[PDB]
Amino acid sequence: SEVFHLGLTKAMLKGAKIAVIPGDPARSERIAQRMDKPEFLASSREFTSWLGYLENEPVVVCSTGIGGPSVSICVEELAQLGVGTFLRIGTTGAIQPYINVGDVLVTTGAVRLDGASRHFAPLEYPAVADFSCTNALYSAAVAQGITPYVGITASSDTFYPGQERYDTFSGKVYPAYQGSLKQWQDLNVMNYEMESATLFTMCAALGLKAGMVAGVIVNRTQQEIPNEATIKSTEQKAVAVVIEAARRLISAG
Amino acid sequence: YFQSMSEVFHLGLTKAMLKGAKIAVIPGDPARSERIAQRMDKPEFLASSREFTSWLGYLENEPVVVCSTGIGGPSVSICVEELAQLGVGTFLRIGTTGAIQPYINVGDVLVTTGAVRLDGASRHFAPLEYPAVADFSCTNALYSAAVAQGITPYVGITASSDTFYPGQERYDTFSGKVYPAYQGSLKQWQDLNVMNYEMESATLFTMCAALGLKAGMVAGVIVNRTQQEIPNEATIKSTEQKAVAVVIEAARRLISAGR
């Protein structure tokens, strides 16, 4: 291979300029299976890649693993192989009581509670999504009968203390993160996630285009856990949005 | 200035004088409020106090405020907060600007999605790590309005500075100096794909996001710091009018979309 981690060569992508980047290596196949003529490319560490076709054009699906550091490797190495646009698809937990399980969130900007973003730009620089990607995702959702929430996401390097979870080994969060959940709620932050600050900041710095959509499967403020059919239909909703957004971006280019 | 004639500390306005306005166009210069209002139906002067000159006018049968902010986040923060107390929910920033990328020309139009926070006021609304990002629908209305008038704007990041001089790494000054933290900073932003400098959007975007208000920004490029040529008054004045026409049409589609 021509890159350090992914196990890929330029030739293997067959001219792909756009990538869909889920977190879980097992999701790559499922997404590529909504595309035309999909084929396995490689699996190396947490990076499982597939190639598929939308609008008769090649598209990579590559898993990123959890967190900015693995995302930064994935994105950098795909960019070396000619990928210029990156669409993040995920499933998330909301922190606003008006956002329900089954809702779809499109993120315009990220609160940078990560470390990797600071290696591409100083903290004062905005972790903001690409306009054309964000539009394609929003337009894709409304066209498919979904009214997404569009706004800001908190992007944390941790699943536990950074998302102010106390159901843990220590049961503690140190003072800088005590009350942080309420802080973000009061600043109209929709949800937590763990990748978008790195993705958006590095893409803006490198001149690459990024966007993100997620399906809500849990609400931190709400009592009752939903059944794992509404979980799966939520995941489907999100994929339908990202696939259609990818087609719009391709047709537009 | 009589506090009895105002429901807010600085603007000299009451809610009723706005006649239900939910949207404001906010230029920097007090002298520009009237001109922008005259693009609307039945324009009327509202008040003038300090750097805050306000007019009302109508678009699509709805009242729209035009209020000047003065230069800088501190004065912008007062203007926005006090209009928000009087029921204004959407703020469209209009201005002219210099660019820092060689491919951006005088006469081009910039729509800003996010701001580098080189200001102070934004930190009074949210911690530094929170993004100074524009409202999606405002940004889309500004872009769409521009395209519908024959203009393809550049869309991207602006550096929002509390100063005109050292914070924009200008050396053509009294001291001729910029201290180390801001030396090389222009090049830094160029290399990070920042389009331009401006002095208000970090505060505007950060505060609106934090308060649940909607903000966007459009600007006409009237100078480029990487370029040698001097631009002429005609193209400059034309660029100002162009950008105003964009902001007005954006307001129109925001109004009709909310109907």
Add this chain to the structure above:
Amino acid sequence: EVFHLGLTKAMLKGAKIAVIPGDPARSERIAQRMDKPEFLASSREFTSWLGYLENEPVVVCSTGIGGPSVSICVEELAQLGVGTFLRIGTTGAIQPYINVGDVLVTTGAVRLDGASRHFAPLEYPAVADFSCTNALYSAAVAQGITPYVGITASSDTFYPGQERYDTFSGKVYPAYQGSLKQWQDLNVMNYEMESATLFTMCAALGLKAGMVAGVIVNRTQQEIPNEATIKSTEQKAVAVVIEAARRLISAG
């Protein structure tokens, strides 16, 4: 000759000192207490008048609200040869012992602004010039006034940075919650919105700055000032700054 102020070196007729209030409406009022007052210019928030004290020309120029517009004013006046800047304002105090009508002379500022950081790193002190501070203090004492002398908190906002809750959101985020009490406990006299930028930039550029303010409101009391109170307090503070300017001119 300068980007914003609409002024030329010639129009200043040799002025080396400026009085810099916030409100453009006050430029003329202050100019009228000097000799041979005349209008110079008005552009955006910057309205400038010229006057004479001890047969020397003195500029009065309004700054607008906040560090950013102050930094433009001071920089551009300095390009035109002004070396000394006297800030006059009205202010709200945060200490109970400070009364409406009192006069404050500020030695240094808490840097809760952005613009100062463009002139020097945060650890550098936003401190007033010795001679300006003394002239302001002396002027006050010579007019029968015992001013408070000390530290001012200089905020880029009027609302959350001064921990106001009487607002559209009614909220202040955690980093500024408890901040007013913090400053009270650190013996800060008052809030204002310009002096951190002024002091820091003047120290950095080798210019001379001082600030005097009249207290029109106390954040620890329930009373709100009427315009007559504002007017008399303003007049009190203007008298101080005019005299301080005479003293600096005479001594120079």
Add this chain to the structure above:
Amino acid sequence: EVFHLGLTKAMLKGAKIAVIPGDPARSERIAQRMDKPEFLASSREFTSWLGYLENEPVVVCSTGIGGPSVSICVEELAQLGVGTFLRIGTTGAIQPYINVGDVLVTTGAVRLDGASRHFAPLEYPAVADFSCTNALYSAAVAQGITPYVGITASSDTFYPGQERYDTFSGKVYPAYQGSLKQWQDLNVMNYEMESATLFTMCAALGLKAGMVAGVIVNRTQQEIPNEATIKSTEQKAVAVVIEAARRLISA
């Protein structure tokens, strides 16, 4: 059962100690060097095996790349009763005198990651546990190796945070320009991407952590190494980490 790892307390069979490599494919290789190895689970980047040393159960669980995934692994293993964590890896040195084939034991980490700040403020030291560090060192010496002991710079990125210019942009922004030289002049041995998170979280949580690594490349050096010396290096490093687990079990 825990949220990410696909594990229950019962599946660990009382294991109090874990060896934690980064690469999912490496968990089996390492478990093969213990007694009665068995696959446990594979979920996302977390592939876990169980094995026995001095007749005692030991988990081997991959972490993926970076503090974020490490923090999930360690947290969830701690919920299941694991109290000690030994990191094994392969690394690139930044000092001219460190050779390919050398072994590094890390006492402390430069915190160039984000996850560590979710456990403790930046001024708090990312320091290895005293016991673990000694076992790693002793294990190495007993096998004829004098490891370098010292400080590692722990980066959230592979590229700009380690000041690499061989990239898509070819750029590193000013705050990281000259940072490699800065760390060299401060006697930092190497870059790595997980230890700041690991050391800081374990100190905050009351858990025990250590780290050993085999050097397979040197950023300052002309040459390029063959896979012979590389494969023996990582084999050497695994041997040190296994023996260290024994020693800790023994005491």
Add this chain to the structure above:
Amino acid sequence: MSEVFHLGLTKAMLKGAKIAVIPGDPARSERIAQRMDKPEFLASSREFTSWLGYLENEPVVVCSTGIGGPSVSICVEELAQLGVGTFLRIGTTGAIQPYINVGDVLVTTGAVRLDGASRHFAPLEYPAVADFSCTNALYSAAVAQGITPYVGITASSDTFYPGQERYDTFSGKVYPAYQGSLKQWQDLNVMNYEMESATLFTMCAALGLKAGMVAGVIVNRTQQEIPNEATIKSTEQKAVAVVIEAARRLISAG
């Protein structure tokens, strides 16, 4: 008993002293006290050597601080526990500006906070600024003794070596955050480096105590000329004369 924790002093031992002169070097306490009426040794504990003397019939303490904000912070806090409200710092210093000569006198209005201890009293944005009345007493005293001091900003460093960008050291190195820092301070019109004033000014403002600082310039690292020993002693003696006279003025005024 009634003794403070570090200084070995009780409130009775001060005999009502409200004002202190605070040199850095233990061995200077006696010398400064001998410039006052009826000097007497009080105590010596660690770096803190204290004497009492009288000026204008009022008792005045002289206590050494040791080097750096941490020991200064002990000294000042514990003297305040004993009723001292006013603190006059006296020393000798190098200068970093070419136009400041050996033998000049510096009165410090403000400090660049390159220390740690100041941050334990106030956040970094809070100004390390001297008390108005102390600063005036020092300036007016100097002018009355035919000196015209420079009045300005001093950089207050927690180190003698790297924080003052010194390369003549064991390592020969200064890490990047401090490379170019001397020139940065020169370009921002800073007069000199010293190691205590940020802590002193910040803590005194925070606690409501009054502080001022005067120093005599005995070296200038930007100049080639080397001063002779007479000029140095004359400068030391001059700085001491100013601080004593300033204390007299403050005592008389109150």
Add this chain to the structure above:
Amino acid sequence: SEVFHLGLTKAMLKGAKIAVIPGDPARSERIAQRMDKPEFLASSREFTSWLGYLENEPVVVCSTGIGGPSVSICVEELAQLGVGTFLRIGTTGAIQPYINVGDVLVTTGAVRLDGASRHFAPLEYPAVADFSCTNALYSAAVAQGITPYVGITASSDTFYPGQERYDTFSGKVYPAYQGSLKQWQDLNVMNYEMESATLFTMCAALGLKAGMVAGVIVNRTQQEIPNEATIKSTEQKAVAVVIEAARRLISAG
């Protein structure tokens, strides 16, 4: 004298490569008198130095004064004179309830609540002790039948507010330090101290070796005042550990 502050020359050290560094100038002599052929070297400001012999090798004992700034002078100037190893000895208070008066603490790392450490390395760099020094100190303690606590110390530039003391002139601590004691307790910090952050950071930056041991003479969390005999015996206990530690380091050379 060929150093600026200590009043020392390389010849006066007679080849010493190692130093014991207490804080109090009055302690230097009695520590040196546990060694063979003790001799006074110099006294300047807070820096009182003595020389002694352990295992036939010369060892300096030099007092540092209080705080990172004076420590930084002492260590720099001794390094200029050829000293490469620095062992810190003192007595301390503990902030953990289970740490008793009489216990011994060996510090692996320091919380950097000081200023001088930042003049040697940026804040993210760890204030970590030298491995061999720490091992020597641990081993010496065990050999005296002491199980020392081994761990993290908080190193403060102040005695009062930075250790969250309210028994003061003002009786006040500003918000950034309110609740800080509790914060450090919950992060398993053992004790406060005033010099280790500077010492460990500078030594790692300069390539010098440092360690620290201390005897606990007071506990913030405990009710009891301990008697003088318990306190004086704790001092002796800790000094015995540091001397033995130095024997081991010398012997290993």
